[PDB]
């Protein structure tokens, strides 16, 4: 019932479940935290910005890797108007045989890609599932830099 | 071990084990005292 809202002693003394709920919803309101100065505020915001950019780059790297690994980017290059892009494969134990058959695309059940990443990456000059892997590797390196 | 075994190795791992340990840690942390 203590020590969770480390940034707020008023919440940490709450004997109810409201402390847990308000601890989540006030975690990023740095200006309202206990023992707070402006320098610490700007420094924490700066570090949070770095972590956020790292998260964005990791998300993009994950999209690239999953298109390279479980997608049909190379097949889509040769026939972009008939082949439907694949986002990533599906492994869900709750599937029946009918669901597996219906979601089956090429070798495994997979989700069609509605993000338009296939067309975007094709336009900027990507033609191989090894070009996407290089992008994922580089973006994970950039995320490490930002962290 | 082929690459197609990775989903069956990772999806249960992440989607069940990570919730369990994360719940353990979060409950322990939010139920601490001083």
């Amino acid at each position: 019932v203590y020590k969770f809202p480390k940034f707020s002693k008023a919440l940490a003394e709450d004997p109810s479940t409201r402390r847990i709920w308000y601890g989540i919803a006030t975690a990023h309101d740095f200006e309202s935290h206990d023992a707070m100065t402006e320098s610490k505020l700007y420094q924490k915001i700066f570090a949070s910005h770095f972590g956020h950019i790292a998260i964005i780059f990791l998300w993009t790297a994950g999209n690239l890797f999953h298109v390279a690994w479980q997608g049909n980017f190379e097949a889509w290059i040769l026939n972009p108007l008939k082949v439907r892009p694949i986002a990533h494969a599906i492994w869900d134990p709750h599937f029946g045989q009918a669901a597996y058959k219906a979601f089956l695309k090429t070798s495994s059940p997979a989700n069609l890609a509605l993000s338009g990443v296939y067309e975007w990456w094709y336009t900027i000059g990507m033609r191989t599932n090894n070009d996407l892997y290089q992008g994922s590797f580089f973006l994970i390196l950039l995320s490490s830099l930002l962290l | 071990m082929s690459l197609d075994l990775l989903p069956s190795f990772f999806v249960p791992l992440v989607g069940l084990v990570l919730p369990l340990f994360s719940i353990i840690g979060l409950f322990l942390y939010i139920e601490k005292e001083n």
Binding site: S48, A54, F65, N129, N130, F137, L147 | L6
Partner: peptide, 30 residues
């Protein structure tokens, strides 16, 4: 089709990015 080595080293590099993330997470304090 990417190889096992390609996926494995990407997983290893992802682990390194994870240790860098907790270091940033712990440095942003409890």
């Amino acid at each position: 089709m990417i190889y096992d080595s390609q996926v494995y080293i990407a997983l290893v590099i992802a682990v390194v990015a994870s240790v860098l993330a907790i270091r940033l997470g712990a440095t942003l304090y409890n």
